[PDB]
């Protein structure tokens, strides 16, 4: 009935540290990843009714799906809304070449709704163009800014790895299977607790998942953009884990 990448609540599209509070449920693929104890530690991106995409280091504490709870359709972090879904992980799938990305099998396929819709996947080895404005979302640390406790968004330009790897920026750390994004002056960035969440770029019709929030030098510092896993370099692996499972 629904299709990927198409929010039924129009995003706010601001000009997570900085950014703004999102319009509730304008990022319907945003997941909150919690331990059995039920508290938010990572984001995630719904790929399809049963599967989630997240960062590997979100999983490096327990190899057991019973230790993970994915929260779908949420806007508030602690006082979850009444429609929100709470589905338990059944399998975890680590990227085999030790990259910071992983897949989660949902025990009960989440029901798609006006507030729970998956994101679209890029085409293999697509390279987001330099200065493309994309969005990052999540519940992570806010540093001095507003909106702690609610889903935030930030609109940020991609910086091509070539520039991002220059010495004054991230000095050779980034490499091919990752992308950069952020403002040269700082002040707007994902941060701790946003890991594993989406970086999406609008393409004509819909949003495309192009990055997975991964790491950085601090958060929102000048000359230090955030680093994201390049989702397009992995789609051929994602489908197979869904395909062959």
């Amino acid at each position: 009935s629904f299709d990927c990448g198409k929010p039924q609540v129009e995003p706010k599209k601001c000009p997570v540290v900085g950014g703004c509070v999102a319009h509730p449920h304008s990022w319907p693929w945003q997941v909150s990843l919690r331990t059995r104890f039920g508290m938010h530690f990572c984001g995630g991106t719904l790929i399809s009714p049963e599967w989630v995409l997240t960062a590997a280091h979100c999983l490096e504490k327990s190899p057991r799906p019973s230790s993970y709870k994915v929260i779908l359709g949420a806007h508030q972090e602690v006082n979850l809304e009444p429609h929100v879904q709470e589905i338990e992980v059944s399998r975890l799938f680590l990227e085999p070449t030790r990259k910071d990305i992983a897949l989660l099998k949902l025990s009960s396929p989440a029901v798609i709704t006006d507030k729970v819709i998956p994101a679209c996947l890029p085409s293999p080895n697509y390279v987001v163009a330099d200065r493309t404005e994309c969005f990052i979302t999540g519940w992570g640390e806010t540093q001095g800014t507003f909106g702690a406790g609610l889903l935030k968004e930030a609109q940020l330009p991609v910086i091509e790895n070539k520039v991002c790897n220059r010495y004054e920026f991230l000095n050779g750390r980034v490499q091919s299977t990752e992308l950069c994004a952020g403002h040269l002056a700082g002040g707007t960035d994902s941060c701790q607790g946003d890991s594993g969440g989406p970086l999406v770029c609008f393409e004509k019709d819909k949003y495309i998942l192009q990055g997975v929030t991964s790491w950085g030098l601090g958060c929102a510092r000048p000359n230090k953009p955030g680093v994201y896993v390049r989702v397009s370099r992995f789609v051929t692996w994602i489908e197979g884990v869904m395909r062959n499972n």
Partner: protein
């Protein structure tokens, strides 16, 4: 220089820990980075607990 100045790459996960300065760090990596910096070693900063201070 970067290690000494407290500039380190860290995952953006929220797994808070407690330093001996009674400050909560949002994950072990961030605390590890300050511990090894000049200002952390200045204050004999160390990890005291594997949860947020007071939580």
């Amino acid at each position: 220089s970067d290690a000494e100045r407290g500039v380190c790459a860290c995952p953006r996960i929220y797994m808070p820990v407690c330093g001996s300065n009674l400050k909560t760090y949002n994950n072990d990596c961030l605390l590890r980075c300050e511990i090894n910096s000049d200002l952390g070693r200045a204050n004999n900063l160390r990890k005291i607990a594997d949860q947020a201070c007071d939580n």
